[PDB]
Amino acid sequence: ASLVGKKIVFVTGNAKKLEEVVQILGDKFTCTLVAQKIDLPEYQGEPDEISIQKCQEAVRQVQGPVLVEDTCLCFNALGGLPGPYIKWFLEKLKPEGLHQLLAGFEDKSAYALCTFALSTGDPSQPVRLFRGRTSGRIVAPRGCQDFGWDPCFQPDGYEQTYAEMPKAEKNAVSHRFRALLELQEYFGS
Template sequence: MAAPLAGKKIVFVTGNAKKLEEVIQILGDKFPCTLVAQKIDLPEYQGEPDEISIQKCQEAARQVQGPVLVEDTCLCFNALGGLPGPYIKWFLEKLKPEGLYQLLAGFEDKSAYALCTFALSTGDPTEPVRLFRGRTSVGTHDASPVGRQRALRLEPMAQGLRQEGGGKGLWSVSSQSFAQTCPWASQLGVLSILTSI
């Protein structure tokens, strides 16, 4: 078994300083490690969300040669069996938010959920990657899109999805009170896991 990570530096794979600030704020001052951001170009893996997170984490750990934390966010429509899921970035680029809404036009169920997965590697390739998941449900979305200039925002630390424009807009994700909605930190005991692996 690897030495405990407590007191060590963990590379959080992101080029976004705001994302790093949010993660540090969410983990709080009792988090036993130091997180540092590092942008790493990773391949675009295919598969289910867990498989993708594990592969990204393993590749990041290989490049860094040390402990890494990787975050992946999915937007999953229930009517589409969880799609676009981890492919939301490309769906948004091609279809824009309005196109996403149009995908659901023939379905009564317009509900969705955001899935945020963190993958942690100790940096030791013989140790398994640990996954921590947070899921936030979205109610039905029966209003047509308004404001063509609005972008669908997927913040990785999803507390809840809300509708913009007084309830008549596109789905968006905010990052307030993360621990209430994405309870991986408390329910899965991330602090005790980090001090023991």
């Protein structure tokens, strides 16, 4: 504290994901975000535990301010699973199969979760977590299928899946945007 005039390492291999984050954190002010691709283990655990383990491991490599991001897709009928294991289930099952997974359960409700984890680089100081969450339903897939699990997720309050949605409207209801919004509300402190 504070990271003003310090360079914060955001771990990503995607400059646009970084650009995305810069823009939407807004101008204010002086915390300087650089993209570094760091190989980190992927951990099992609850969503909060994974982000913290991940952030702590980023910190021992970087030894400086670091930011990391995770996403989960949580089916309520499965107690929040696949959750942090969603990548594996998507790869194996496809959006069709993710929907088929819930065939024996009446409750198709689900939420998407984005978690950012931030450390100052000082290990004595705790990792700080910033989340955003979007409630919704798992559905038979609709929309463009290059979109990850977006085709099977219909946010509440909409007739469109994430994948059908035009990007503007998706930005409004997005688990990612919510989390970043919590990032600013921190910032300055």
